[PDB]
Structure 1
């Protein structure tokens, strides 16, 4: 009841908004601890018919279930308790002072390699927990990802999640279009494909990699179905000048999640085993054959020499290179993107007609207007 809601919490200010759900900050009176409450209008202002009123409850009743199946894990919010009324459904969870990753990705257009590594290190380690418990999300968008004051990822809105029965593969289309895996559309356009399994989350996570490190979705174009053929066919490019400055270890791991065929996809457990997420543990013996020692000393030299060489190569900003090609070189390109999102950062929102790629023009107008 609503009395049970106000006997423990008091909502102070409005944090965010949604289609029918409102996120509101509250104070827990017994503990005086900051907590977020999401306030879903079940009746939805009267627009919801009794079916949607019932369906939203069943979706919400299910929604408590998954958030009740996963708990105590560092990188998904804890549904502290849930209150249901005839007209609302209150869900109290942790307070994330900073907003979604979309808002952050708007502030910093291109998210740096070190920062994304721990971001997704959590997300992949999030993905492992879901797959080990056999629960797929189907909704892994950055707006579904919440960040706290220490930048820690808090995956949010398992609203589209559903627990696969052991060895069962879904058919319903759930998810905003860009972040849908190729067989999501294929199952939508054919009945022979008997469904998709838990490998769906791998593609959605690999999409964040292209968005975070480049500021654009891997496949984006303004009409709806055209994006889909880029997805199922799987035509993606680490285009220039943007994607050449990043290290090569980035590219391969991006392709692994982005393979169109599900069985060859890079599952979460081995996903964390790719060279990017390797960590330097100080206490390792690391024994090596005499050839192995010789490489290390050679590689230690090869490294030092390399670092001097790479740096010597960086071209200081001069008048001419600005005139010929600003985007080509990193410091000016990241700047143009940065002041691109300060002027029109309000023009990026959730959906298809408001994605971040609308703020980037990487192709000639003629090729864009070819068809």
Structure 2
């Protein structure tokens, strides 16, 4: 909380990089070394339209945020707070410059992602979540919009505005965040005050939801009405589309089902998730010993794979323009091109909020008289 003169004579602002609800991010340089950085200027007065209780609570919130982010600093995959400057009207928070935007624009441009980058991002997120849980700190705000990408595909968590310390033996009873990412425990806290509380399970549910939306391309739960969406979430009857996931492995789908569990106790932890065979890999080892049955099994598996590879290659179908006449959605290239073209035509009506979402573009429902039955 040094004087503003130090910031004025040490950092020189530059052009705007982005805008927010009440803050804008600008580029700055460090005069001694000419190192680029990003500074977040927060107007605690809110342009003078804030009653002083609002100013006081915003100042308390930002002080809590800075002193909770002070401890976490050190992890390579987390945002680094380089300098802090405080005035009676403005806060200057200096972080690392990333380069590009966060996950929303990337996913919108690429429509859907493959498993190769998915494995890496999920591994990094699980490591970060495990480290955060080890430090007895919770976040409750995993959204794709709070994860930034570097030029080398590096992710680090940011926007900890809702993070708070959790004393052991305590059970929080507060409700916050986007309803689509709300775990059933939080909503149960909403209706009923007798429920004890929640914990890291909401974090696992959020991880499952973001994994689902990056894989399928649409959120697992979404509807035009909030009440029906909440009932949809409470029911916990997420379904798999038929002509959408016919080219994905069984292990990934099993992991999908394992992440999303209604019972809080049965939900998998970060350590348990990291031990799944999906992340299994080998470098080198020479202590493989077993019975002759093991040798026969391994040789049979090798022969079976060698035989099956050719048959799997042979299972390709031609273009079948007649099938295109009947149904073009069956073919994967036709589906991907139709999807990408629909996205580029209608690409500037996908933004923040429940009013507009990616799920509003796809219509897998058979639009007919069955739309009459909606709810009670």
TM-score (norm 1): 0.94
Higher relative contact order (CA 8 A, sep 6+): 1
> d(CA) in 1 for partners of 2:247 and 2:370?
25
> d(CA) in 1 for partners of 2:179 and 2:240?
21
* Residue 216 of structure 1: how far off its partner (Å): 0.7
Larger Rg: 2
Q: Deviations over 1:56-91 (max 9, x none)?
A: 222211211232121221221111222222222221
Corresponding residue of 2:188: 186
* Residue 112 of structure 1: how far off its partner (Å): 0.5
Q: Deviations over 1:96-151 (max 9, x none)?
A: 11211111111111110111110111001111011111111111000011111111
- Name the stretch that deviates more: 79-88 or 219-228: 79-88
- Name the stretch that deviates more: 326-335 or 258-267: 326-335
Q: Does the 8 Å CA contact 1:21/1:38 hold for their aligned counterparts?
A: yes
SS at match of 1:253: helix
Distance 1:12 1:248, change over 3 A: same
Distance 1:289 1:336, change over 3 A: farther
Q: Does the 8 Å CA contact 1:100/1:143 hold for their aligned counterparts?
A: yes
Which consecutive unaligned segments of at least 5 residues does structure 1 have? Answer: none
Corresponding residue of 2:27: 25
> d(CA) in 2 for partners of 1:367 and 1:214?
27
Distance 1:165 1:110, change over 3 A: same
* Residue 38 of structure 1: how far off its partner (Å): 1.9
- Name the stretch that deviates more: 161-170 or 7-16: 7-16
Distance 1:216 1:290, change over 3 A: same
SS at match of 2:84: strand
Q: Deviations over 1:323-361 (max 9, x none)?
A: 333333322222222222222222111111122111211
RMSD: 1.9
> d(CA) in 2 for partners of 1:367 and 1:301?
53
* Residue 33 of structure 1: how far off its partner (Å): 2.2
Q: Deviations over 1:14-58 (max 9, x none)?
A: 222221122222222223222222222222234433232222222
> d(CA) in 2 for partners of 1:288 and 1:327?
49
* Residue 318 of structure 1: how far off its partner (Å): 2.9
Q: Does the 8 Å CA contact 1:13/1:24 hold for their aligned counterparts?
A: yes
Distance 1:324 1:287, change over 3 A: farther
Q: Does the 8 Å CA contact 1:181/1:232 hold for their aligned counterparts?
A: no
Distance 1:370 1:84, change over 3 A: farther
> d(CA) in 2 for partners of 1:267 and 1:58?
33
